[model samples]
Every structure is written in structure tokens, then in C-alpha cells.
Target: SMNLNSIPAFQDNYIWVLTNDEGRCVIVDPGEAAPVLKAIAEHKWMPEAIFLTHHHHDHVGGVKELLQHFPQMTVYGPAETQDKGATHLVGDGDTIRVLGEKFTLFATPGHTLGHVCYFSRPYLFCGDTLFSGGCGRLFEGTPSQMYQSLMKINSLPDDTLICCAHEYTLANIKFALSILPHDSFINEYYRKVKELRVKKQMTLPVILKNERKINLFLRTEDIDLINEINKETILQQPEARFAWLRSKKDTF
Candidate 1:
């Protein structure tokens, strides 16, 4: 079984690399080249392609540098995003096989309109869309776009490993505590994430199963959570509740 190694970049970005049997591999969201280049050199692995989730500078910044070494590698990304050097433009329901593993693409817009997530059953390479305890800010899309995106992801298997791009688990959990302090599960997850951070660890690759109970963003229909949010903002609709929570999280 092939799995990705997390390479930290910038302050919190996680650039994932999936190695294969023959030493060939696939790179995901290489924001910087130095760490990736060093890894490739040390592992003696050949990178075959780049899987981009969006055009955010922190996500696509290292594309040009990476191509300098492996120019022949195919670059896959959302069809709506113009040129991030993506030779393979894909949309929802598109499929691509990497290192013999089949990954289906979902058009998960929100953090960006063209943002797409690669799902290979239980493993999800979600860029900036669905974080462990929260979702991304509305940079370009509306609440509907963002909510629908999360819904598509929520529809997947609960055992899925959410390979998020950024390591915002502790911060998001901290923010969640301020809103849902009464929720036992949220409290437990917050302490767990805090412990991980205190140890200088990366708390990511969150399981979707656990995320359901801790990540309030995915539980938009939970009557108790909705009641809590409504105490602050009188939003009756689920989408309205989600929008209010996201708005509050933005400043929190």
C-alpha cells in the first residue's frame, strides 16, 4: 500500500508525496521547491506528476520550479482555473490513476471556485476546503458553493482520511471551543489537538469518521449545534447557519 509523506512548508502548509513501487511518485500542492527537491534527492524517487487543488500562491507557488526538474510530468488541476501549468484539465467525475491507485475528482469549489479534491475512496487530498475542525474562508465562492463542496466530501466514506493541505487543526479547534463549549466531543478533540501542538507535532490526515462529531461545519443539520449558533445569529436555514459559523470563525 502506498501512502504520502508530509513535507512541511511555509508556516503550516503540508506538501504531500506519494511514492510508488518503482521509486516513481506523485507530488501534491508543492508550495515550495526546496523541501520537495531535497526529499526527491534524498529518497532517490522520480516524480511523475503534480496534482494541484487550486491556484492559491501558497499551493501552486512551486510549480514552475518543480517543472524545471521533471518537465515531462503531467500536471492535473481544475478545468476552470486557467493555466497553473495544468496540462490535464479535469472536472467533477473525472478519474486519474496514480501509481496504480485510482482517484476520482470532485468539483469542490469554495476556498476557490475551481478548487477540486482528489478522492481515492478513504484517502482525500483536499487542498484548503475541508479542514479537520473547520472549512476554508470564502475567498471567491459563495456559502452555497462552499457548503455543497463540503457536502460532496461528507457523502464519501466515513473512514476516509482527509489529507488537508494546511495544518490548522489546533487553531480551528480553539475557535470551535469558543462557540461550542458545551459539546463534549469538541472539547475532547480540542484538548487532543492542543496536546499534539504542545509536542510540536502535525495533527492532520484527520479521519472523516471522527471529523463528523468534532467538525461542526460538517454537522450543519445538528439541532443542538444549530440552536447554539442561532443564539448568536438568528439563522434558521442550514446554509444560513453554516454561513454564520464561517463568518464568526473568520474573525475568531
Candidate 2:
């Protein structure tokens, strides 16, 4: 089994370190070198690979320095970033083997044209594409693309752990509450996350099951959400409603 740990970087960024029992490790979306290096030291393992989900600065800033320390470390990244120093250029349906585990890659291209998410068994390391209760801005893709991407992620097992790159649960949960104030699940989860954050705890590794219940972006077809959208705006189409809600959240 693979063990996972996270090192916080720059304000809300999380650099994930996944390891097996063999003293080999893989760092996902390392934003800076110091935190990842510290995590490697804390776990007493050598990084054998670095997985990149996209070419965003906050996600790829540490790659060069990390390569300096582990020159032989294989770099796996989206095929669209030509200069990302990716040894294995991957896209949708490509499967990569790392540390004796197979990770399936999917082109979830709404956050960026080359944005991809890695799925290994029951874990998903989806950089800025999907979040606990929100989706990333449509920087390089369209609403239809993000709609399909959300559907693909929703197809995963409910037990899958969503390992997003940022710790935005508190803000996302607050937004969720504004949209669904009476949702018991959202209220309860908000309380739990608030408590965890107050204690300086990580609110990540959110389960897909809970996300299905509380995440509005994932529940675009729900009757209550659709009704709310209709009440708020004239755009009754599901995708348009979703876009409006996302835009509103952007400023909130």
C-alpha cells in the first residue's frame, strides 16, 4: 500500500509525498524545493519521481531544484508543456508505473488545456482542476469541457480520495453553505473542517462520497440546485447556471 503525506508551501499550496515501504517516494506538484526536501528528510526516503499535473508556476516552481538534488528522478507531466522537462509525456488514457503502482492519467482540461489528473487505485491527485467543493477557473478550456471533466471524476469510486493541490476547504465550504445553507451534510462538514483548521490541521484527502453530497459543482443536476439557479437568474440551462454560480463564487 502507498502511504501519503503533505507539506504545506507558499500560502495554500500542498506538496504531496507518496511512498511505499521500499524507501522510494514520488512528489506530486511540488511548489517549492525546501518543503518537499524537508518532507523527504522527515520520511527518510529518496524521491524517485516527480509528477506534474499542469504547468502552473505554483505547481512546477520546484521541479528544477528538485532535479538538481535527484538527477535521475523521472519527471512525468502533461504532454502539452513542451518545455516542462517531462521524461514521460502523458495524456488521457496513458498509464504510468511508479513505485510498483500504476497511475491512470486523464485529460481533465478545463483548468488548462494540458491539465491532467492522476488516478492510482483510489487516490486522485488533481492539481487545480477539481477541488473539495469547487472547480478551477476556465483559464484554457470551456464550460462544456469542465462539465465533462466533472462527470469523468464523478464516475470514480465514491471511496476515492481527492488529493487537490490547495487547502481551500474552509473557503469552499463557506461558499457551499451560502448556496445550500440548510444542507445538513454541508453544515456538519463545515463545522468539522472549521475545527480542523483551527487546530492547524490539513483539511484535504476529502472523500469522493462526501464531495458528491456537498459539492454544488459536482451536483449541477440536483433539483434543489437547479431550482436555486432558476430563482437567481434567467439562465435555466444547467451549464449556464453552473457558470453563473462559479462566477459569483469567484468574487465571493
Candidate 3:
């Protein structure tokens, strides 16, 4: 398995680093170049490639500059870009070998129309599609799309490590409390996340198994959660309930 960590960039965004034992590495969603360059220089690492999950600026903004340094490095992402550096355009079902592991891509839209995710056995580099306690804003896709996307991730093996793009855990927990204040799992998770955030530590690359129980976005079908939604939004269907949660979160 590849050793992975993240370089904090552009406020709360985390540019993930996927590195191997030989010092060759890859970075995902490099929103800015300075922090990445500094990280590489500090670690004495070599850039092998760049992988993008979407076309958003915070995801692809530093691609051109990273390319300027490693001109021969293979660039991979969705088929379109304003970054002007991707040499490969991939979508659903395509697999790419990264650091000796086969990473199968899933086309998970909601954060953006063409948003995708990279997953192998126990790792998921999900950029903003599924956060710790909440999901991304409906920027280019509908609640249906986002809900399906979250479900898709939930279908992955229980132990999968979710590497989301931003550090939104604490804020999401607060919002989750607003929706389901009586949930013990949410309350427990809130306390843990609160402790972590108070110490200013990163609370990401979370386990997918934990998310199944804690993330409100993933638990829209649960009976107790549905009870709360019924009282508030009065939406009955599963998808509509999910949409109601999303809309309330959009304002939250």
C-alpha cells in the first residue's frame, strides 16, 4: 500500500499526497503550488503524477504550475478542464495504476456535474462529494445525484478510508446536531470531533464504516432520521427526504 498524508492548502482544503517507498509520489487536488512545492522539497520526494476528481479551481488550480515543474509527469482527470494540463481524461469504470495499486474511478456527481472519485481496496479519494457529517453544496447537480453519490460510496467495503478534499468535520457535526440532536452516535462523534478540532488536529481520512453510522447524508434512509425529517420538511419519499436534508444544510 502507498503511504498517504495531506498538505493543507487554500484555507481548509487538503491536497493529498500519495507516496511510495522510493520517494516517487502523486498528489490529488493541488489547489495551490507553493505548499506542494514546499512539501516535496521538505520530504525530498519526486512528483510522479497528478490526479484530479473534478474541474473545480480548488481541485485543479495548481495543475499548470505543477506541470511546469514536472513536464513529463502524467496528468489524469475527467475529460474536460480549464486547468489545461490533464493528459488523461477518465470517468466511471476506468482504472489507473497508482503507486502499484489499481485505483478504479467512480463517476460521483453532485459537487459538480462530472465529479468523480478514486478508490482501491481500502482507500477513497472523494473530493467534496461526501464529507464527514455532511455533503457538498448542490453546485451543478441535484439532491438525487448527490444522494446517489453518497450511497455509492457507502456501498464500498466497510473498512475503506475516505480521503475527502476539505477539513469540514467539526462544522458538519454541528449541522448534524441541528437536524438530529438526540442521536447518540452523532453526539458521540461530535464530542470526539470537538476534541480533535480544539487541539487543531486533522480529523479526516475517516473510516467508511464510521461514516455509515455518523454521516447524516448517508443515513437518510434510517427510520429515526426519517422521523425528524417528516416533522420538519414533511417529505415522504426517501430521495425527497434526502433532498430536504440537503436543502436545510444548504441554509445551515
Q: lDDT tens string, model 2, 1-252? A: 898888898999998888888978889988798898887888888889999989888888898899899997998899765476677788899998897899999999888888999999788998888888788878888887877788889899988889999888889889988888888888888999899999999998889998888788888888888777777677767677778777777888
Lowest lDDT 10-residue stretch of candidate 2? 79-88
- Residue pairs with clashing backbones, model 1: none
Give the per-residue lDDT of model 3 (tens digit) for 1-252. Answer: 688879999989999988888888888989898899889899987888888888888988889898898886777787755345678888899999877778899988898988889987787988989888888888999888998898899999999999999899999989999989989999999999999989988888899999878898999889989888777667767778888888888888
TM-score of 1: 0.96
- Name the lDDT value of residue 244 in candidate 2: 77
Q: How far off is residue 82 in model 3, in Å?
A: 6.0
Clashes of each: 0, 0, 0
lDDT of 1 at 110: 90
Candidate 2 lDDT (Cα, whole model)? 0.86
lDDT tens per residue, model 1, 184-241 = 9999998899999999899988899999899989989988788887787787677888
**What's the CA RMSD of model 2 in angstroms?**
1.3
- Which window of 10 residues has the lowest lDDT sum in candidate 3? 78-87
